[PDB]
Amino acid sequence: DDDKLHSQANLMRLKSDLFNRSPMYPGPTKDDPLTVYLSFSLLDIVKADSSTNEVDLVYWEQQSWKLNSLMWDPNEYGNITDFRTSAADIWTPDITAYSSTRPVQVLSPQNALVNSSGHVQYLPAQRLSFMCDPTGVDSEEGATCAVKFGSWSYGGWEIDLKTDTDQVDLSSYYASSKYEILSATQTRQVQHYSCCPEPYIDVNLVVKFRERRAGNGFFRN
Amino acid sequence: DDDDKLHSQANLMRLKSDLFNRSPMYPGPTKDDPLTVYLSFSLLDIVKADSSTNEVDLVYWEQQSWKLNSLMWDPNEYGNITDFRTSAADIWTPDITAYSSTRPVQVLSPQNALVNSSGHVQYLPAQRLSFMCDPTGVDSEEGATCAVKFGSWSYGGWEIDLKTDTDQVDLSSYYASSKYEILSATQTRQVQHYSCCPEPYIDVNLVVKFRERR
């Protein structure tokens, strides 16, 4: 049972070495660029407001990246290959929804997973209000909306974005939602501004949805 | 007698300082240092059920308990203190969360925890929760049925194992004049597997059947 206090001490020592004994990573630069992978799972479309043209979505947004400053040798740490930590202990990217109408709300505990090769996985669940015209949601063809995500302060030469797939994950979508999903895609886009040389990257989340019509009966999920 | 109670008070200051200021905070469980967390619910009120958004608002107390070796002490060195209350910010707490909440949880009680000499912690946040629920049927005799799963957000079953003492949600505090009456409320431990990973994942499924008070 002295093995247990031992591995606890190894973890404590690892985090102290990583966090306490080095200054926090200052973020990416044009000389030290970063790639952030984004992926979305849509959970629920909660509300569509046709008087303001705002829609409210609940989703999980997976973010991952890699820092050399987060690497270690599992063998000096008693074979710890990964650990959970508070997101406040690490640098995280400034990714944001460009068309939000209210401050995004965080639904999940804010913690991340770091492994020995320096990879970070951060998966905040969020509630978002964003600009969307729901017109046609009460029909069978439904309504279509889009919101773009990306760094607020960094261009493409500092932070690049990529997605693993263009399919947004619907496997967790709430089956009894007021709204059913017809389709959801997530697409990397490159934009330029005349005033500036560098590219700007965003991931475009496009959702087609309609009012769910129920039969009379219990729909179980 | 009044000079004993000053020692008593100094004994706790000393115990608190020895636990909290001497080693670092517990950095969560690991695969080879896993932790069991007991979870149990007491439902207070169903406040609102919204047909327009399909969200329901529950008020409840969520009882969490676990045990840490680093929180143990010998009461004889501490003036026979067997336990104390402390701010929850002073201790590690599990990341248990409702998977299908639609709004940030609202905290209805001061956040303090009880720690006892064998290192067991008792944490009892009272909360208001909005979660995804379709209230249809709430006006029938059969009523409406909703489910919300709770568990660790970031830790798997090899790190945090999750348990209940009973599969019965505690109704003894449920508000008798609520707009909604409770037909049944259950809390069931479930084990889940993802094809992506060998690790089992644990949740407690809170299932509630309810209808408008008639």
Add this chain to the structure above:
Amino acid sequence: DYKDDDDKLHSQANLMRLKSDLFNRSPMYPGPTKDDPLTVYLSFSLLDIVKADSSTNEVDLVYWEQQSWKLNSLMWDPNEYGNITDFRTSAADIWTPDITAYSSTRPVQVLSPQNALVNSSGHVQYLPAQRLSFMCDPTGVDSEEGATCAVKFGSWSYGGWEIDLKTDTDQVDLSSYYASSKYEILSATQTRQVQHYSCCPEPYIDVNLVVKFRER
């Protein structure tokens, strides 16, 4: 006069010296224990019943809650500190009890600066003004007999062997109640209660606030 100015200066330095000896000398009070229990006195003054929602069965109440307790670690000899017999300070500088409404439906909102009064015998007086939403069925509010609701207040984490709760009176103070409120108060009472549970030896104390009210 620079004699008056010096006087002012010396008296400020005295209060500063008192506060520094109390607060910066010994670690903050760790809270009460079985061997060192604390008595907390509660009293309520009702200000407005702002609304009653019959769709959710919630009521919103504005009130002032007076809390007071004594700590030996807050005591001083006024002779050593310029004849200061008391002072006002931020509620953050001192231990406060964990008293909470057991049947709130939303986090309680604090309406007043959070400051407390401390006296040389170690007594603390703290009067937060608050707005609370709590579970109440306001059926009958539209009839002469009115509606009745109750909410219990007490320590969330400390049982009766640690914190003992008491009331000055069993009569809620109505003297500051808003005369133009949508609801008039038929009566309000505040009563200490002691509860025991099969599971546990320790008694649990609360103060039970019962308000009977109807539309103006």
Add this chain to the structure above:
Amino acid sequence: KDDDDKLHSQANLMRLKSDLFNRSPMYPGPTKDDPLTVYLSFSLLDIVKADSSTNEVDLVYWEQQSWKLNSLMWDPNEYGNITDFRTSAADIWTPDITAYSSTRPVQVLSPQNALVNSSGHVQYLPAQRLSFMCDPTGVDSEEGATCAVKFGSWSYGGWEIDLKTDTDQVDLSSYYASSKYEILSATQTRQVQHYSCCPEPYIDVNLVVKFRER
């Protein structure tokens, strides 16, 4: 060269702030032996909402507060002739003035910073949105509705803090011309309150506003 003088005046300001704030313990607040006079004045910006279902009204206003501390004085000659500065309100003591009949926490609409001058005067001007207890009945007639809310210290009696007003007329010059509600009059009046339990008098400023639908 010119950048040198500017650099010097910055150093001067920083030196003054350090001497005032870092080089001494903050003012403990007023006492019976060291009382403080606080000047209060109101400018009404907008009556936003009048809710007849709850009897609450929502006002946007700025509240001017000023007082003088000997411990904020300095000789401009030792400070590069700085006669005043702007500072964060957290850096200095501010009085506990409060609306006694508020129904929700006041919302702060302006950056919280104060102006301090060499003679020790502080000027602090928070812009606020306030919901308070008011019965709007009559708001739909030509006579209008009347409402009053009292402002004063929460924790200090008249022997510690004394309130004064510059004038009994509330400043309307900034009132929003297109507001849903028109102002017939607004007065701000110092009042002395007595309670049976206590020798100490209690001071407040009573803000009375007559208004009607525009």
Add this chain to the structure above:
Amino acid sequence: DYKDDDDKLHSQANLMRLKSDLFNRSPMYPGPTKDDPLTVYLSFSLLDIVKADSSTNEVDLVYWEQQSWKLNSLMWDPNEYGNITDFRTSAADIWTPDITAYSSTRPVQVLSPQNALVNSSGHVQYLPAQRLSFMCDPTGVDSEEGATCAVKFGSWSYGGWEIDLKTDTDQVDLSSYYASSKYEILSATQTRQVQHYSCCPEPYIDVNLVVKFRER
């Protein structure tokens, strides 16, 4: 590449070194004075008119507000810092101006991470995205001429001798305005104004944002 990783490490150290020298090596900037006046450039990009409330005469606007200024104490020689000419940093790490909307009815809400760009000549660029409720009478929004509203922005505590405000253009940027908004913009202008008060010698500067809009 392994030596390529040494170079990245070195560049991280350079930036960390830079920030440490700017921030931890001096007391905070105390803000502007009449002897060290400051010019702030303001520009607006209109995003959405979310809601026009005719029962309260409040309108809710989503916009980006670009603020730019220059501090001598933020300058550095890139040659001493590995040729870094700019960096991003948390807005909390720097002084920021007190610019505020004078006719807001609710606290402004921040929609974007608060970080700023600083470059070697001492220029800062801060671009908060915000949602603002302000006093506006939406009458005529359902007609052809539409409705017209205006809100003034400027320093809350500094006069013209300390903070001067400019705009680069009198034209609000509409290129990002949501095409599907409930409301379409007929025009938006942003104009520097100089306010004078009888009581005071010092002028007070503001930027007046005027928006003419109607139901789509």
